[PDB]
Design a protein around this ligand. Structure first.
Ligand SMILES: Nc1ncnc2c1ncn2[C@@H]1O[C@H](COP(=O)(O)OP(=O)(O)NP(=O)(O)O)[C@@H](O)[C@H]1O
Ligand SMILES: C[C@@](O)(CCOP(=O)(O)O)CC(=O)O
Ligand SMILES: [Mg+2]
Length: 329
């Protein structure tokens, strides 16, 4: 057996705006892993601990995302002169607790995970951009309403500055042209590392209220206007520059602008608990905001001194917020 793993992700800035082609988002990798075990066998067997039953390749709704990923990979392997053969695949480490997902991008992680598993099983490797394209193709083919930012971050497993591409356009290419031709074209996206140059604690507060990404996007996308898109893009650029220049005060400023833009976009993004999560940092050398589609899941914080981190943690503790993850940037 060969084992592989994929991380999770959490947006720092650029949410919603990133849905429009050419926009920017700053996305952070989270080392909480989805894991897989794969080996050739005499029949196809696929099991994910998110469910209480296994399936083979015959279509099943619970497993459709995984099966569609395998199907796309069957085509990729063909391009590379390889034929799909029966294998047993086990997926575990579901990014949920007590039946509730954390909000770490499990959908995107499992697609990258399965692509990684089949590549490893077939002794093949692909670079970062190709991995992103292969995993993105799966979501594009099923008409996903996401920006693919989660795939960009998980593929890179780093804090990345992601520039979105036109998903409707690439999906059209995939429906009309052979996969190799589509993969070889420049899609027009960008994924690059952002390395902060100052010390700081990164905290993740889980509100334990599940928020469905596709539902949030479906209802809030109509609220997106140009003023928001322009402001968001500038804010992501300024935040990246602040992190790279190591200026705490400018980071606090831009994260606050990002948060206010989200609040203005929709009253559904900030739930009372997500709002309390960011309010807990208002008088500290730290800053916080909702992360992702909002409507539940997690909030993130960046703290610039020991005292601020201690107080922020105590406040979140008293607020019923679970400290899901913490890291010294
Ligand atoms: N571990 C898994 N095993 C099998 N399928 C999964 C798994 N994780 C996610 N999926 C599929 O992805 C769907 C939605 O992803 P989910 O993890 O629920 O939230 P999400 O779409 O990632 N939103 P967010 O987690 O906030 O980025 C699930 O309903 C399944 O279809
Ligand atoms: C709202 C959105 O911009 C980010 C969603 O973030 P998350 O999947 O809730 O962590 C949607 C997307 O970009 O796919
Ligand atoms: Mg979410």
């Amino acid at each position: 057996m060969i084992a592989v793993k994929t991380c999770g992700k959490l947006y720092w800035a650029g949410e919603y705006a990133i849905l429009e082609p050419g926009q920017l988002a700053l996305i952070k990798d989270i080392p909480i892993y989805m894991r897989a075990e794969i080996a050739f066998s005499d029949s196809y067997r696929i099991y994910s601990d998110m469910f209480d039953f296994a399936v083979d390749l015959r279509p099943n709704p619970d497993y459709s995302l995984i099966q569609e990923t395998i199907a796309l990979m069957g085509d990729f392997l063909a391009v590379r002169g390889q034929n799909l053969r029966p294998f047993s695949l086990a997926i575990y480490g579901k990014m949920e607790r007590e039946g509730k997902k954390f909000g770490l991008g499990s959908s995107g992680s499992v697609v990258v995970l399965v692509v990684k598993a089949l590549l490893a099983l077939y002794n093949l490797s692909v670079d970062q951009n190709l991995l992103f394209k292969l995993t993105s193709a799966v979501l594009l083919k099923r008409g996903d309403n996401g920006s693919m930012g989660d795939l960009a971050c998980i593929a890179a497993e780093d804090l990345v500055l992601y520039q979105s591409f036109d998903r409707q356009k690439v999906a059209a290419w995939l429906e009309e042209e052979n996969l190799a031709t589509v993969l070889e074209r420049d899609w027009g996206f960008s994924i690059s590392q952002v390395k902060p140059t100052l010390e700081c604690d990164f905290l993740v507060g889980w509100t334990k209220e599940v928020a469905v990404s596709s539902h949030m996007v479906q209802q809030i996308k109509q609220n997106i206007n140009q003023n928001f898109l322009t402001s968001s893009k500038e804010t992501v650029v300024s935040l990246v520059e602040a992190l790279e220049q190591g200026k705490s005060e400018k980071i606090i400023e831009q994260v606050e602008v990002a948060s206010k833009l989200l609040e203005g976009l929709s009253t559904d993004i900030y739930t009372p608990l997500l709002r309390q999560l960011k309010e807990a940092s208002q008088d500290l050398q730290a800053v916080a905001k909702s992360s992702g589609a909002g409507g539940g899941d997690c909030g993130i914080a960046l703290s610039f001194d020991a005292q601020s981190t201690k107080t922020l943690k105590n406040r979140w503790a008293d607020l019923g917020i679970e400290l899901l993850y913490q890291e010294r940037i």
